[PDB]
Amino acid sequence: DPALRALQNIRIVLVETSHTGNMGSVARAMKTMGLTNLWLVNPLVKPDSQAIALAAGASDVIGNAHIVDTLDEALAGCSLVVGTSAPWPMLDPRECGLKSVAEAANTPVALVFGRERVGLTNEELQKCHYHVAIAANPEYSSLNLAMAVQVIAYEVRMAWLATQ
Amino acid sequence: DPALRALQNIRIVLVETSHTGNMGSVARAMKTMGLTNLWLVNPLVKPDSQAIALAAGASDVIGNAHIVDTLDEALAGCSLVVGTSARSRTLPWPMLDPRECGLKSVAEAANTPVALVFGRERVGLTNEELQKCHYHVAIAANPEYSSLNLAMAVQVIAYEVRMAWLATQ
Ligand SMILES: Nc1ncnc2c1ncn2[C@@H]1O[C@H](CSCC[C@H](N)C(=O)O)[C@@H](O)[C@H]1O
Ligand SMILES: Nc1ncnc2c1ncn2[C@@H]1O[C@H](CSCC[C@H](N)C(=O)O)[C@@H](O)[C@H]1O
C-alpha cells in the first residue's frame, strides 16, 4: 500500500471494547483503508478467536495491536487527539481526515472511539483536542463501533489520496 | 429525520446476501444515514432473529424490506442505477467514487427512484448484473486488502449520500 507510511502514525484507539467481534471488524475496516496501528485500552476481554475470525485478512492488525491499561498510555506522544461522539471544538469526518493526515506526516495522531453502548466518558472526551460527530439520522444516530471506524478511516484515506 | 423525504427514493439493493447478520448490519448502516428502503434480491435465507439482532434499532428497515426474485424487479422504475464494483479491464464501465455517487444519487432522488446495488459477500456482482447499472462505484482502498465487508461498503456509500444531502442545506 503506497499509503502505508503516511498513515502508520494514525492510532485507532478503542476504549474498553466489550465485544471481541467488533475489535476484529475494526481491524478489517482499518486495513481496507490502509490503517495498521490499533490500540486497545482496557478491553473487557483481550482479542480471541472471534476477533481473529472477524479480522479475517486483517488479523495482523489485531496481532500487532497495543493493549494498554489506560487512555493516557494510548495518547502518550500524540500531538493531535480526536474523540468521536454522536462545548468543544468540532470537526466532521471529512475535516478530521484532512487534519489527521496532515499531522500524521510528522507525529502520532490518536482517533479515539468509545464503548459499544456508552461511548466515551466525559473525562475521556476532555483529553481530546477535537470531537468528531458523524452527521446522522437524528432518530437514530448511533453507528456500530466498527462502522464508525470505517467512516472515519474512509475519510482518512480520501484525505491521503488528495495529497497525491 | 429532515432528510427523510429527500432520501426516500434511494433504494439499497442487496443481491443474494448469504448471511442474515449482514442484512441486519446493512439495515443499521442505512437507518443511521436516513435511508429506509431496502430491497433483497433472492436472499439465500430470509431475515431471521440474527438480522433483527444486528439491525438493533433499525429492525423496521428489515421489517419493511422488499424481497424479490430478480434484480430487474428491484431496478424497475429507477432512473439511476449504480452498482458496486472495481474498475475492470474485462468490462470497462463508467466509474464513480462514493463522493460522486452520493452527489448524483441525491440530485436524482429529488425526483425519481435511484438504486444502489451491492453484491454477494466475497464475490460481488456478475457481469450481467453489472450491465444493468448506469455507473459503477468503487470505494478506493488498500491495494493489499481492498474488499470491504458488505455492510461496511453500504455504510460508506450511505455516509456519502447523507453528506451530499447535507450539502444541499
Ligand atoms: N454518529 C456518530 N458519530 C461519531 N462517532 C460515532 C457515531 N456513532 C458511533 N460512533 C462511535 O462508535 C462508538 C460506539 S456507539 C456509542 C454511543 C453513541 N452513539 C456515541 O457516539 O457516543 C462511539 O463511542 C463512537 O466512537
Ligand atoms: N472497494 C469496494 N468498492 C465498492 N464496493 C465494495 C468494495 N468492497 C466491498 N464492496 C461491496 O461489498 C460487497 C461484497 S465484497 C466483494 C467486492 C466486489 N467484488 C467489488 O469488486 O467491489 C460487494 O459486492 C460490494 O457491494
Q: What angle do CA B83, B129, B51 make, to 5 degrees?
A: 70
> Cell numbers of A100, please?
489527521
How far out from the chain centre does Cα A45 lie? 18
CA distance A50 to A157: 27
Report angle CA B9, B15, B20 to the nearest 5 degrees: 100
Rounded to whole angstroms, how far apart are CA atoms B23 and B14?
A: 8
**What's the length of chain B?**
169
Q: Whose CA is nearest to atom 13 of ligand 2?
A: B150
Residues forming a β-bridge with B95: B136
Cα A53 off chain centre by: 20
Q: In what order do the strands lie in the sheet with B114-118?
A: B66-68, B37-41, B10-15, B114-118, B80-84, B135-137, B95-96
Q: Of all helices (H) and strands (E), which one includes residue B103?
A: helix B98-109
Which amino acid, one-letter code, is at B109? Answer: A
Report how far apart the first and last C-alpha atoms of chain B are (Å, whole number).
Answer: 13
H/E element, A62: helix A59-63
**β-sheet bridge partners, residue B37:** B11
Residue of B nearest to A146 (CA): B152
Of B14, B2, B71, nearest in space to B38 by CA: B14
Closest CA of chain A from B121, distance in Å: 13
Question: From the CB of residue B45, how many other CB atoms can be counted at a distance below 10 Å?
Answer: 12
DSSP summary character for residue B134: S
CATH number of the domain within which A126 lies: 3.40.1280.10
Is residue A114 within 8 Å of residue A71, measured between CB atoms?
no
Question: Cβ of A36: how many Cβ atoms within 10 Å?
Answer: 21
What is chain A's Cα-based Rg? Answer: 14
Q: Is the CB of B148 under 6 A from ligand 2?
A: yes
| Closest listed ligand to the CA of A122 | 1
Q: Which cell numbers in the block locate residue B33?
A: 444515514
Helix (H, G, I), strand (E, B) or coil at A137: coil
Amino acid at site B4: L
Report the C-alpha gap between A115 and A19 in whole angstroms.
9
Q: Are B155 and B31 in contact (CB under 8 A)?
A: no
E strand or H helix at A39: strand A37-41
Yes or no, beta carbons of A135 and B58 under 8 Å apart: no
Q: How many domains does chain B have?
A: 1
- Cα–Cα distances in angstroms (integers) from residue B19 to residues A22, A67, A138, B10, B147, in the given order: 17, 31, 28, 23, 17
State if residue B8 touches ligand 2 by the CB under 6 angstroms criterion: no
- Nearest residue (by CA) to ligand 1, atom 9, is A143
Domain, as residue range, for B146 = 5-169
Q: In degrees to the nearest 10, what's the CA dihedral of A78, A80, A83, A87?
A: 130
Tell me which residues of chain B have a C-beta less than 8 Å from any C-beta of chain A.
Answer: 1-3, 25, 28-29, 31-34, 57-58, 98-99, 139-149, 151-152, 155-156, 159, 162-163, 166
Angle between helices B150-167 and B20-32 (to 10 degrees): 10
Residue entry with cell 424479490: B68
Specify the DSSP class assigned to residue B145: S
Q: List Cβ neighbours of A9 (8 Å cut-off, separation of 6 or more).
A: A37, A104, A105, A106, A107, A108, A109
Q: Report which protein residue has its CA nearest ligand 2's atom 15.
A: B122
CB B56 within 8 A of CB A159: no
Q: Provide the 8-state DSSP code for A45.
A: S
Cell output for B169:
442545506
DSSP calls for B8-59: TTEEEEEES---HHHHHHHHHHHHHTT--EEEEES-SS---HHHHHHHGGGH
Taking a C-beta distance cutoff of 8 angstroms, is the pair A58, A36 a contact?
no
A7 CB neighbours in chain B (<8 A) are: none
- Burial of A61-92, coded b for 16+ CB within 10 Å and e otherwise, reads bbeebeebeebeebbeebebbbbbbbeeeebe
In the structure grid, which three cell numbers stand for residue B115, read together?
Answer: 438504486
Distance (Å, rounded) from C-alpha A153 to C-alpha B120?
A: 23
Flag if B140 and A158 touch (Cβ within 8 Å): yes
- Is-contact A14 A38, C-beta < 8 A? yes
Is residue B85 in contact with ligand 2, taking CB distance under 6 Å? yes
Distance A120 CA to ligand 1 centre (A): 8
- Which resolution in angstroms does this entry have? 1.9
Output the CA torsion A74→A77→A83→A89 (10° steps): 160
Sequence-distant (≥ 6) Cβ neighbours of residue B88 within 8 angstroms: none
